[PDB]
Write a protein that binds this ligand. Structure first.
Ligand code: PRO
Length: 97
């Protein structure tokens, strides 16, 4: 579960500037719900965002959602029902792209 490999397979990243980055992973047939596969604050959020760019993972800024995911959903956990709609919207955009 190395940082680069996690980002590489991620579906979408949601961010609050350089402070927080949340890497979400959803694949029908593999994940029953979107999974928080990687998270970072500060230097680590910066690392995530540069790797995202290198691997062409869509990065969407949403400050309240990035904040709330970071507070509530730890790396390696699925999202909770609170997040289903908002994260479903972010996944559809990533698919759009
Ligand atoms: O400090 C926080 O807000 C988050 C909670 C889970 C991991 N870090």
């Amino acid at each position: 579960g190395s940082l680069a490999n996690n980002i590489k397979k991620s579906t979408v990243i949601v961010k609050n500037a350089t402070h927080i980055a949340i890497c979400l992973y959803y694949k029908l047939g593999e994940t029953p719900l979107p999974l928080v596969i990687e998270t970072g604050k500060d230097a680590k959020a910066l690392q995530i965002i540069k790797l995202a760019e290198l691997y062409d993972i869509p990065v969407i800024e949403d400050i309240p959602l990035a904040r709330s995911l970071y507070k509530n959903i730890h790396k390696g956990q699925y999202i909770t029902e609170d997040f289903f709609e908002p994260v479903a919207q972010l996944i559809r955009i990533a698919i759009d792209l």
